[PDB]
Amino acid sequence: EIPGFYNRFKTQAEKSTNTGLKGRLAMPIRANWGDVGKVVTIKNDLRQLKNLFGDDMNYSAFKLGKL
Amino acid sequence: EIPGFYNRFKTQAEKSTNTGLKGRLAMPIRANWGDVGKVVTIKNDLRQLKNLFGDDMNYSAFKLGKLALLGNVKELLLYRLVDGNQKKGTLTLKDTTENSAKDVIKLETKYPTARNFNVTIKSNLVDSDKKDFIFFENTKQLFSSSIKGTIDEIVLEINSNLDNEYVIATKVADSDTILANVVNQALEGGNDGCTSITNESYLKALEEFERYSFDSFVLDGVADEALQETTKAWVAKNKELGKDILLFLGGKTEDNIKQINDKSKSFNDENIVNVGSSAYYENIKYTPSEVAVYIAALSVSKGITGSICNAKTIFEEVEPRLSQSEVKECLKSGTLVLDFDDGDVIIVDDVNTFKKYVDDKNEAMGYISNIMFINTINKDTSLKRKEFVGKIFNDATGQTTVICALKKYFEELMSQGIISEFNVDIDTELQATAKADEFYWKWDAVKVDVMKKIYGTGYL
Amino acid sequence: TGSICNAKTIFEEVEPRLSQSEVKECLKSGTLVLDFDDGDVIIVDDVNTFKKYVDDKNEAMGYISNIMFINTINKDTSLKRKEFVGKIFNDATGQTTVICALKKYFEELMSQGIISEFNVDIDTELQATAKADEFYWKWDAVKVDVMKKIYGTGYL
């Protein structure tokens, strides 16, 4: 680069981390909503499940995902 | 010098000083009066603003300047916006000795304008050849003078006294003849400054503003959308170029709180602050951008060692007015909105438009004070560039000197209490990969917080 | 013991004025152009016209300070010519004396910190092929660099 003193700040995840989670699980699911024909990874926030596959407890998807 | 005991007294500013001001602000302005095409710095005395840009509240210049000055900015930097047709007022004078009268003096306003600056010339009652030159604005007299009937001395006197600073006199011909009498003749031919002002004028003003350094920008108290995206891109460019400029914005008065929140969602760069609430100060309303001028001014005046989350405002009323649900909606949207928590108008919080997002750019980045802190650190560091770049040899000694200087700076910050904890060290991870002509370094810190929320529990 | 890549200039204005793209274009072209990085006029970099080419004449040769260093070494060495040429017998003693003098000079340079590492020795490859009335010698060095670029990363 050109000479100079160019800062690039990286307070991304300074101390916003916790180690209370582990493992990964497979899930065939019936769902009223969400993507079809693909294996999608869901982070442990249930909001992600609610967004990507709906919030209907009548279906295996949301109920088993919450469990 | 020659031998002797020569005193030179320096009771200039012995104890005539106070420390109640800080910060600097940028201002594109429309004005009826004042300099054009230059970025002029204004000290916080409003008399300076009144002198250099007039006292007309119909124009963005004086009104937004007064708001910024009440924001307690140390130095307010202005720029007069105009269309190319914008022009100075002018008047011409003629002799009377000759039957074929010839123009001999022309009067032109010192600054471009369209106001009714008027002039009167009459026969002097004491001396025969003298003419009494008097100047007005809508018959409100500015200055009076009397000079004999020679054109050179007349124009020299008219240009000499700064009481006649509103107008410049120039000689049209080298006559020694008696001038013609005029009575309250306006300096016509001028054009105002609100004439056909468009986005291109603001773009040119911003390009002029690229020269300087600022703590904040507010964009003339105008909420035009295309100007807002243009200024957003401009500030992003300035940030990438190492100029850390903060931007405040205010939505249109017609926008509902939902629309304001949508706009505050659209903006997500940390250097963008969207203002929703309108207000009254002297029983006169202010659009969200006009009060965005004031909130930016107050923020920069606060500087470090402060915030705005409950700073009292000068405004006597605020609207639209929000329940706690609406306030929470606006804060979640990143909108900043004033509030009437008490009999005065009070700023609700320190939020910016970015606050809609959370984790990578941390939640403190959602607050304006943290951004001001980071910009200040970047600015002081980019001041250190010239001290250290190209002047020390990259050896262990040079690296140690740089680290020691940065440590001294951060310890100065610690002494002020702004930082609760810090460490600064060489970035040995990147220093291993660093080329021989460069240096990498790392630092952690913990800015000292402020009470926004407080809770009490009682036992009896 | 210095450079020009950010030396402040006496000039109150500079033109034509360049964005980072234009600056990078000029540096890649080997052009040297002043800049207005702050309220003063500042020299952008240490580049020379050669810098367009890269590897054989190394990238440091693209910088003027390295050329000044090399010219200074050549000048001091060509000053030593008159001390050593035609005045010492090419035996092991004369070669050792020449090498010791050059080592003393380079150690003086090391004391100033200009060089981070060096070695100077007889060029035994060419000395084997050398005619009896001549001498060959070799030296490696590492000039001490200067910060042109600096990068910082922050944690809060």
Residue numbers in the entry:
A (entry chain L): 13 to 79
B (entry chain S): 13 to 472
C (entry chain M): 317 to 472
Provide passages from the article that reported this PDB entry.
Here, we reveal the extended and contracted atomic structures of an intact contractile-tailed phage (φCD508) that binds to and penetrates the protective S-layer of the Gram-positive human pathogen Clostridioides difficile. The virion can be divided into five distinct regions: the head, neck, tail, baseplate, and needle. Structures of purified φCD508 virions in both extended and contracted conformations were determined by single-particle EM of frozen-hydrated samples; the resolution ranged from 2.6 to 4.0 Å for the extended phage, and 2.9 to 4.2 Å for the contracted form.
Contraction of φCD508 in urea reduces the tail length by just 20%, whereas most CIS tails that have been described contract to ∼50% of their extended length; the outer diameter of the sheath increases from 230 to 250 Å, and the inner diameter from 78 to 94 Å, sufficient to break contacts between gp55 sheath domain I helices and the tail tube gp56. The contracted sheath retains the arrangement of gp55 subunits in a six-stranded helix, but with a decrease in helical rise from 39 Å to 32 Å, and a concomitant increase in twist from 19 to 34°. The measured 20% reduction (48 nm) in tail length is consistent with a decrease in helical rise from 39 Å to 32 Å for 57 rings of sheath protein. The contraction-induced movement of the gp55 sheath proteins can be modeled as a rigid body pivoting motion about domain I. The overall RMSD between sheath protein monomers in the extended and contracted form is 0.63 Å, confirming a rigid body movement of these proteins. In both the extended and the contracted form, the sheath ring retains integrity through its mesh network, similar to the sheath of other CISs. In helical reconstructions of the contracted tail, the tail tube cannot be resolved because of a mismatch between the helical parameters of the sheath and the tail tube. As the tail tube does not contract, the resulting mismatch in length drives the tail tube through the bottom of the baseplate. Furthermore, the X-loop blocks complete contraction of the tail for φCD508; we modeled the φCD508 sheath proteins into a more contracted conformation, based on pyocin trunk structures, but increased contraction of φCD508 sheath proteins led to steric clashes between the X-loop and the neighboring N-terminal linker, as well as domain II of a neighboring sheath. In the contracted phage tail, which lacks the packing interactions between the tail tube and the sheath, the bending stiffness (persistence length) is also significantly reduced.
